[PDB]
Amino acid sequence: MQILWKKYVKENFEMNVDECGIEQGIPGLGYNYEVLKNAVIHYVTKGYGTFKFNGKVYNLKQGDIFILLKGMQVEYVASIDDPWEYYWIGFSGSNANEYLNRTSITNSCVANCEENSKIPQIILNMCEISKTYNPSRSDDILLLKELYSLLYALIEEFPKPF
Amino acid sequence: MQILWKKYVKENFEMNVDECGIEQGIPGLGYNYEVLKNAVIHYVTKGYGTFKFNGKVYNLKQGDIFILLKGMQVEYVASIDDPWEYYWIGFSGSNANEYLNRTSITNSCVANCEENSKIPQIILNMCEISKTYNPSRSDDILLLKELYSLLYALIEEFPKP
């Protein structure tokens, strides 16, 4: 029921691309679970949905981001009228977790990408690569390069105060 | 002596930027040693020098690359007439060593960059960052991003079959 759901092996422990996904929601349907994966950033490419976390209910649309971190009790559901499509990057590693603690997003776990954000292009590009993933053509190197670019862009656009 | 020689800590074991350097050579002077560092790619930005490895003697110039790998007995010397300047990136890690085994450059340890090579810009950019390295502005993330771009560019331009 996903356009794309590429799951990668966990062979790197400093920086690792765990999975890349694309899902068109069905109206009024979503997911309600305790997050098991290390970290999963979602980018809303179309339509509307809601993200519920820690007593707060966010009405998200095209351009918005939400991030799932291990242990979060979450619910995210497509709108009954105009159901969202989202792209996601799951990632892990000691370096990945250190870089996430340098961004302001890991508190509220929701954000909006600005006009000239570099984040949408990186997430879309990582999902594009994932559709024809070929490690013998060194797609593994390119995905890690993009993951470093993505975490740099998150810190650049959503900095924690120094 | 070196206008730049930034040495970094070895804290990453999958991919690590070990050092970045810029050296204008002195005529007829060079180095003659067994390489201790994991991997060190040099890009010749001007003049001429020679790289001697395993009985072969290479006359290099602007645009050329040579790579030092741990254990290589090497000699590299600036030309008397027109001494080279080179930029270098030292790097290590299991991923780094796997990706190096995917490029044809680790056979001869020498290459020439094509007209529109992406390699010069990356090495120059990593040395530029190294001059004002500020980890609290996440320069550490940017240098590893550039190292992944560099190894990708080496494989793209100098592939094994």
Ligand SMILES: OC[C@H]1O[C@@H](O[C@H]2[C@H](O)[C@@H](O)[C@H](O)O[C@@H]2CO)[C@H](O)[C@@H](O)[C@H]1O
């Ligand atoms: O991981 C992003 C992905 O999450 C799916 O939800 C899964 C989750 O991945 C898995 O760890 C958990 O055990 O089950 C969840 C399904 O209830 C979403 O289905 C998918 O749309 C993405 O959001």
Ligand SMILES: OC[C@H]1O[C@@H](O[C@H]2[C@H](O)[C@@H](O)[C@H](O)O[C@@H]2CO)[C@H](O)[C@@H](O)[C@H]1O
């Ligand atoms: O590492 C590139 C750098 O090497 C210098 O030579 C050093 C080398 O780094 C060190 O490991 C070894 O013990 O001694 C060498 C000096 O003899 C070069 O001086 C420098 O120009 C770069 O090529």
